Amino acid sequence: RWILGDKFDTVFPHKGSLKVLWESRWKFACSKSVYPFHDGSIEDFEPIFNHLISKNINDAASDEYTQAFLPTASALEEKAAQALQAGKHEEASNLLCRAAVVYRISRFPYVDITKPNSIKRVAFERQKQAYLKATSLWTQPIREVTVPHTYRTGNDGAHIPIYIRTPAGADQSNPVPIVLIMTGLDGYRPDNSQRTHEILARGWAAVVAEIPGTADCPADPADPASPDRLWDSVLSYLDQRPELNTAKMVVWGLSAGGYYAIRAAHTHRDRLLGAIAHGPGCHYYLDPEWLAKVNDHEYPFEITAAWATKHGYKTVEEFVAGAQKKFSLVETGIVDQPSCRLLLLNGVDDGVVPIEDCLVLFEHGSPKEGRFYKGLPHMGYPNSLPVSYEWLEQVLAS
Ligand SMILES: Oc1cc(O)c2ccccc2c1
């Protein structure tokens, strides 16, 4: 049935084994300081994972996993405190960024938005504090703005915390283009350092916002229209900001954020020059046959429990039964209207969201843009990253 083919019916070897996950993927990813260990150091993680493997802790959702990371984070914060006092601001920033990655992995894969007393929420709260302190020392610092949700209705929260970073020379006389990052299930606003570096290096502003049913997003996760109101608030705030040119704006949806990039490309087409959807779902990812096997593929841990809560469902059974008809951009007809330019990027052999969720968008609305990587899993890294920046350079060209 699925383009994924033989791999669909496979149980991936790291399933329920943090040992195999580490030894076969995460150890290498950590060494290279690439996702999910970007900004991070193997010297910080190897002792923690050796501890987790020795105690045979495989459930990332459990407190035993989360709390294994916190003493390392503490020691890094003290090393940073020492570095700062000695006037070593670059070292202190790096140590705090390293602490942020330790907190990030500790709260993998999902901070439960309904359980604010959870250790993973506490980990995320400490990560944000570490990260803001680290980035306050940058020549172009990341600044948090709490955007009032003026377009809030129903069960929407009041406040939209976003990260903004502006390149050197950005002012009312010379306002700069905007790349608006929409983050994912396991990546929130502090998890995008290198993306902000690249955006600023091309003379653009970086704005980072979390998606409904994650992190500090106030959008009603149960209301499919909640993202539309969320972006009405964010885009209205950016319109007012004198140094940011909203006439040259692109949205960048990462993984779970890809759904929201695709949706926004239709709902807000007249306010966007373009949208990138990186490893997106929009329809077939909520197919019960797909959700039956999604836990058996490349995602480091169980995903269906996190997905249930992120889609505003109290139970996984209720999620599998109801999600597609409610949230599908195809089923609901969101795709049957025009869109701004939309670049779809993924691995052909994505076992997290199906490649069919890129391909189906070519059978609706405006012409779409795509590059899909043969034999590559979810996100189609590393190939899919540099093409992202090539496309932004074209769309935002002077
Ligand atoms: O921002 C992201 C999010 C992901 O889920 C990724 C997965 C694999 C490789 C890079 C990623 C980057």
Author numbering: 3 to 400
Task: Tell me, in the authors' exact words, what the paper reports.
A common step during their assembly is polyketide trimming, which Afyg1p, Wdyg1p, and PlAntI catalyze. In summary, the N‐ and C‐domains in all three enzymes are oriented in a back‐to‐back fashion forming an interface that encloses the intramolecular binding cavity next to the active site. The catalytic triad is formed exclusively by the α/β‐hydrolase domain with the nucleophilic serine located in the consensus GXSXG esterase motif. The resulting Ser‐His‐Asp network is perfectly aligned with distances in the range of 2.5–2.8 Å between the active‐site residues.
The specificity pocket of Afyg1p and Wdyg1p share many conserved residues and molecule‐binding features with some notable differences. The electron density map displays the pi‐stacking of the planar naphthalene ring systems with Met381 and Tyr37 (analogous to Met379 and Tyr39, respectively, of Wdyg1p). In contrast to Wdyg1p, the cavity in Afyg1p:1,3‐DHN is enclosed by Tyr383, which is rotated by 90° compared to the apo state and extends additional pi–pi‐stacking interactions with 1,3‐DHN (3.7 Å). Strikingly, in comparison with the Afyg1p:1,3‐DHN complex structure, THN is rotated 90° in‐plane and shifted almost 4 Å deeper into the pocket, resulting in an open and spacious binding cavity between the active site and the surrounding bulk solvent that extends ≈7 × 10 × 12 Å3.
